[PDB]
Amino acid sequence: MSKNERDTSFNKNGCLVFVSRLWDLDKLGMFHHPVSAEELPDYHTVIKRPVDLSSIRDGIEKGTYATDVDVQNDVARMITNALEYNAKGSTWYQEAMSFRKTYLDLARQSG
Template identity: 30%
Template structure:
């Protein structure tokens, strides 16, 4: 949950906190078949559906991929999703490195 909290505190996270509705993005659910958002990821962590960092990272990447797949490259949401994805990957990698260093030490 610490890792989720760090990513959910990102400056662009508000775009991804709740599920996307067709009112917000017309036709979204005809393009995106497996919608993902931070709220759903949090519920999956709490319920035990996400148990590993790899599963967490998979769902995070799906969330960003959905945003970049639906929006065109020149759209603001595409750009923000791409930047947040890079920051989230860095955060996940740092967390894994810290875990590895702690485990080896």
């Protein structure tokens, strides 16, 4: 269980803030899967870099990251992509954009 508050390699804080904020943004709740091409024919353009639960869970578990810097950058990119795809105008758009203001902060300021 766990490893350490900080070993200059694994930033558990980033994962907690990421999943925590992600759950809030995704009103549907428990949302963590790649978009279907059938509905997103331009997924390659909108989300050049898709995100999946198995891919993310496997990445952190394996240690794909390198440090607080790598984790921070990854999270930032994920947020940008999500916003680019969720960019509509409804309440979800504002909520996502508003949370994004603290999404990166929580995944960088704590570390």
